[PDB]
A paper describes a structure:
The human type 1 insulin-like growth factor receptor (IGF-1R) is a disulfide-linked homodimeric member of the receptor tyrosine kinase family (Ullrich et al., 1986, Lemmon and Schlessinger, 2010) that signals into Ras/ERK or PI3K/Akt pathways in response to activation by the insulin-like growth factors I and II (IGF-I and IGF-II) (Adams et al., 2000, Denley et al., 2005, Riedemann and Macaulay, 2006, Laviola et al., 2007, Tao et al., 2007). IGF-1R signaling is involved in normal human growth and development (Denley et al., 2005) and in maintenance of neuroplasticity (Dyer et al., 2016). Despite these advances, there is currently no three-dimensional (3D) structure of IGF-II bound to IGF-1R or to IR-A. To begin to address this shortcoming, we present here single-particle cryo-EM structures of IGF-II bound to the intact ectodomain of IGF-1R.
The quality of the map corresponding to the open-leg structure is lower than that of the closed-leg structure, permitting only rigid-body positioning of domains into the map followed by limited real-space refinement. Secondary-structure elements within the density for the domains FnIII-3 and FnIII-3′ were not readily discerned, leading to preclusion of these domains from the open-leg atomic model. Surprisingly, neither of the two FnIII-2 leg modules appear to make contact with the ligand-free (L1′-CR′) + αCT module in the open-leg structure. By contrast, the density of the (L1′-CR′) + αCT module is relatively well defined within the open-leg map, with the αCT helix being visible in an apo-like conformation on the surface of domain L1′ and with protrusions in the map being identifiable with the aromatic residues Tyr688 and Phe692. No interpretable density is apparent for domains IDα and IDα′ apart from the αCT segment of IDα. Nevertheless, the existence of the open-leg conformation for the IGF-II-bound ectodomain is unanticipated, as such a “wide” open-leg conformation has not been detected previously in the cryo-EM studies of insulin-bound holo-IR, insulin-bound zipper IR ectodomain, or IGF-I-bound holoIGF-1R. One possibility is that the leg conformation of structure is an artifact of the zipper attachment, which might limit the mobility of the IDα and IDα′ segments and lead—upon ligand binding—to their entrapment between domain L1′ and the respective domains FnIII-2 and FnIII-2′.
Residue numbers in the entry:
A (entry chain A): 577 to 633, 682 to 704, 744 to 799
B (entry chain B): 1 to 37, 41 to 154, 162 to 300, 577 to 633, 744 to 799
Write the structure that this text describes.
């Protein structure tokens, strides 16, 4: 049976420029199928709550497990508030995002699909946080 | 109802309704392959002898939904020495089994419950004995489950001390040292000593939820009355009851048999039925017809006192005998009563040495009553008299106090 890809591996990100971000990741541990594409999402995160207001100035277990397998072998299993910007990934586990708010924090979500995500759905996200370079 | 002689529940929760009238289950419970298309509650169930097994029960979020009052599992027989197994319970988030007061025999194994929280929020040492045998793997990562207890109560959980909870709304309920080894009712009212787990009234063997030893006619009892005999390991039945018991249908199927005061499906090995397959077993006399190195320290050296000025002591053969065991040589030393302590007003010791003949047991005499003693036992193989004797296996024990 086909399945949901693994989450992306080794999700890693940086900013090389103010208002710009670079992100790199690695292909999923188990594609379980041809990858189709990755989808990366990002959203402005608010700067942390409060903060603003305050003035800061021997073993045998395999024969055990077989017991659970033996009951299974009696039955088959047979498959038939700020806005997000978003972009799909065509190829690389790398993409670049621009016109970001300088020095703001963003969430980045990365999902890894496969050829069956049009039917199975795409994988859950592997995700990381990074900050853009401030507006020099 | 005494349900039985064995329960196998699979596929559908609509089949789970068999429990509506059950309160005791004779024999194991298996729960397999259930998938749902609801809440369920079975507070009538209170004690299971033997073990409970659940496997791939989709659609249950917490165990306190089904079996809140399930108070004792005896584990008289074990699944590979396990009395409870929970496997691949996708979606189970907590153990709200908050009346669970004892698991008598058996270890616990807990695998693949990837959403289970309240993992180590339960003091297993309160409810069951050799917790060191448990196996808890692949469940929701506690570092990321981030369990929580209200407040309730806490204990020295391994290297920690931490609050103990079944679920956010229910803790692992416990009894004070006024009951201690003995059970209690909710309000810390001590149960009857023949009782087990929670009680509907304190100190009454006729008001028990369960019995530690045996049950009969609404009475918790230590052993079967003379015309009553041990059955399974929890209740007594009369000579005629087992006389009604044809064993399980089998090529070797016969009536149950009574022996050593237990009524059992068949005689223990080395014993046979009297005469024409009689109700009682009898033993068969004979087979029934168809270089050195330094020894380890001794093992399991243990000792106690039954009298002032005396001690009794027992041990086990060493981990590595490294030879034929010859004998044991026992030493003992006075410890001081603990340092500091003495100075506040709250209102050089000799070794003895002696050499054992044969037993892992010996007696020591003329001690000061209530003084603490170190016993050092050195274990010397036939070449230890050249090699040097073993390091010690050791214990500290106290003489019974002088009144």
């Amino acid at each position: 049976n086909a399945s949901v890809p693994s989450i992306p591996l080794d999700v890693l990100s940086a900013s090389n420029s103010s208002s710009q971000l670079i992100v790199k990741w690695n292909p999923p541990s188990l594609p379980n199928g041809n990858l189709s594409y990755y989808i990366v999402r990002w959203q402005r995160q608010p700067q942390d709550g409060y903060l603003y207001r305050h003035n800061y100035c021997e073993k045998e277990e395999a024969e055990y497990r077989k017991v659970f397998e033996n009951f299974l072998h009696n039955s088959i299993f047979v498959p038939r508030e700020y806005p997000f910007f978003e972009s799909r990934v065509d190829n690389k586990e790398r993409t670049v995002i621009s016109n970001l708010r300088p020095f703001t924090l963003y969430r980045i979500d990365i999902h890894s699909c496969n050829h069956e995500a049009e039917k199975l759905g795409c994988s859950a996200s592997n995700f990381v946080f990074a900050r853009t370079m401030p507006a020099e």
